[PDB]
Nucleic acid binder design. Sequence first.
RNA 1: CAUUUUUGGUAAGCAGAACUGGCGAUGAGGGAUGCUCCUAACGCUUGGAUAAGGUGCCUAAAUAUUCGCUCAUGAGAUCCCA
RNA 2: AAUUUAAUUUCAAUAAAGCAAUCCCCUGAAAUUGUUUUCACUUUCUCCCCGCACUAAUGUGGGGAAAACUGGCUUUAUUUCU
Lengths: 185, 201, 146, 180, 103
Amino acid sequence: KTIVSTQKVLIPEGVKVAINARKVTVSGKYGTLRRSFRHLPIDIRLNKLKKYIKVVMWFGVPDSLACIRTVCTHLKNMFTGVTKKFLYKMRLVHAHFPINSNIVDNNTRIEIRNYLGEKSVRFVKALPGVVIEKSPNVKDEIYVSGADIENVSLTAALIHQSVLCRNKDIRKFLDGIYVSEVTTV
Amino acid sequence: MYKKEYVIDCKGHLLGRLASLIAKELLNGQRIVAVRCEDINISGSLYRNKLKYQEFLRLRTNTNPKKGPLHLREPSKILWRCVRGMLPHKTYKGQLALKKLKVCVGMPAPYDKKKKYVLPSALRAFRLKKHRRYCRLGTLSSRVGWNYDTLVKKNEVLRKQVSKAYYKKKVNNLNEKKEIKTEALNLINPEQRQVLENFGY
Amino acid sequence: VELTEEELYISKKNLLFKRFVEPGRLCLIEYGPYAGKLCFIVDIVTITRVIVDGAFITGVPRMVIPLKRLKLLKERIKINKNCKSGFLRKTVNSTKVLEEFNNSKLGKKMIIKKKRDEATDFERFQVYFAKRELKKKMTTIKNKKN
Amino acid sequence: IDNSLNTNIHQYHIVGRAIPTAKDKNPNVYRMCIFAKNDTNAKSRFWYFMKKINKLKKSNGELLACEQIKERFPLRVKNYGVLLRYDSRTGTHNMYKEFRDTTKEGAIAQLYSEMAGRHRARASSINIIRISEISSSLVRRPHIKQLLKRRLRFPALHLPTLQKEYRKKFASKRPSTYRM
Amino acid sequence: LQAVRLYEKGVILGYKRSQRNQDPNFTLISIKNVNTKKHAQFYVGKRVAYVYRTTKHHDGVKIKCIWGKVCRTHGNSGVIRAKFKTHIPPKAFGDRVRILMYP
RNA sequence: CAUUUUUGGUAAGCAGAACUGGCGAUGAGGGAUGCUCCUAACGCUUGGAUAAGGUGCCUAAAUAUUCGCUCAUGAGAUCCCA
RNA sequence: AAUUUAAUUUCAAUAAAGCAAUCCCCUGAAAUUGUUUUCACUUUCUCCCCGCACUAAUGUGGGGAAAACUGGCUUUAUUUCU
């Protein structure tokens, strides 16, 4: 058992932060993110004038300490997102059949065609706020980008899950779409 | 105990405790109108509650399900069955106690303009720790097929607009009364005024 | 270095809860035979338990209690951690903290309540008569007002 | 004084010796302090120690003195360190704990409560070996170190509790956890 | 307005039960705002009246009354044991009872 | 038949013994429920105060106080005793 | 709701004096049981220096000093101020 646990999180230059009773809100260059924390005990205190956020816990236990670190990192990701969007580079791999990637609906809905010659379409609609662009560079790269660290990852995960094969040795058959590079725009 | 009807806003109450407290009052003879049962909380995680309820749903007589235990799926009726469990309902005095209780989801019309009470002993926030999961009865009801949750929610919103209009008028009325009272305070004879003042009225 | 308008910012920094159980804070006992008394928090024993001490003005002696039985008030005196009863009597009277509590709304309501409970039969009638008179004047004014 | 917060553990100083005989003209005299729920219980515990350590039983010995000890300054804090021998379901262990309290007696009462809670030790199953007041700089357990900080303060965050007079079955509106 | 009470309201609970055994000699009464042993103790010496209505006349009137006495507190929570001249009929469980000012 | 001592038998609500107490022939209160467990042995009543056991509701007593521990997507909860 | 004289290391103010500074009532850690000696232990709404607002903290992290307000003791009176 322990009396006090704290953490102090710097705020980047461009952000408009505004917390209120564990409803944290961050706005910035690339849109506004709201992300509730009122499930958790926590004495979030704000500091607009000199920047920084202070997270402070009273009477923690190691569970609580873990939570404080979890909240702060997640908040920092949100700042990172609004300042400079997350770019997740996903390379589409094929041994044999050429996997056809058709982006429609204003960088929503990536339609994936011809996976292992199946002659059937796999559609994976994105999370809101999520661009699916294609690379101009290396032909099989596909860009999943956005403000929210969660939504881009979930979209990427959805794409990855949607593709991969069934009942063949996964040691041998490698075809499918994978996450290469975690970056920002 | 001694009033004609307690109306209870069941929102934020813990199932068992609310039932036990209601049952003792019913047995003694106090009439209880239980309203707004969907935001009754059962304690613990949702999945756990669903699984337990699924076993209760699973239970049926082999012979003839017409004479099987009645399941129910409606939140008010769930509360009611639980209250019946906490009374000796196969007796005649007990049967009267069960009858004394009336339950309903949302708030019907003759209960619209009567005061809702809360039982502070059975309030969730003062009895479940804040890192231990909890669960809305209405949600549970939707998952096991009640399918009348959205409609009740629509009704709650409608009542709130009526309530806010009434409250705004009322607050204004309190201001008028208060303003008249302070003004006509110094039309009272000194001695009487002083006694009234002494006890700060 | 010192603060000029950063002073204002710190001042209106609205912390989510005040009244830390720090030595010298005023407390209203909510439970047990010494309930309804006011008292100062002297020491802190351990995470559960605190040493409370009435003023010799408020009249409950120095003793250990569990923290759960107190309801802390805004007001606090600037006393040293070490403090014992003589220094506490001299200080509490001098800075007039009880008076501040009495002037505060909850204290004011407390003193009215104590009188109202203790009030004699004549007094009970008297309040009714005065209130009835008030109702007559007030009702007449409302009727006039239209 | 509040009975509800009362405990009945006291410290008794006991002195005894063996009955003199032709073989033993002047016996070795033994004194000990023992933490007990009454003086008879103190004696019994002392007798059990006499049987376990020395060669003696109640029947062939005599008590020289029995007196209660009570704390000199019961309203100033001390850090008490205790060393225990206890028996578990498998076997036997020695252990060292620290307690912030106002008397030795308070420390033992908390310790019995703790040993029951964390180790399922029944009162029978506990044996006190040495309790002494320890300096703040020498404290070894983290929760006691935290208390010993320079300007201790914290917010209250415990739920309200109150007399039977106000703990009524119906209320005007939802009460608030918050507090100021 | 007319005929103001001068008695404290009450509710006739059960008999002086124990689990699955019944004693009809004592009735258990809850009094309007009593709630503790100490508060209950204030009423201990006082007179109790159970008044009830019947369908047809007795002594020319529709009301009869059984008289009792408070006689000891019961438990912590302010319930009182009351002894009547004749056992209270159990159909009156949850009915009203009057705790008068006398003696 | 129970504790304790105990021989046969893999064990058995099995077979056979030892000491004592029961039960049988024995209600009553408790153990939810029960021939044997606990309490306690019984004329008829009135008041008192308890035992064994309980005190969220069923259910009479505390949603008592006080310090701990415990989350379980088949928790845990009372000698004999399941 | 109380109450008598005992007994058991109880206390605490009061208001005039004084005494010692990591000092003191105490309590630590050290060189056939006594006993003495070493250095260890207080405050702070004080001051200074670095970190200059760095905090959960109307303050602060570190590093130094200061004092006796505070605490502790010795006296002398005093007990319905308490």
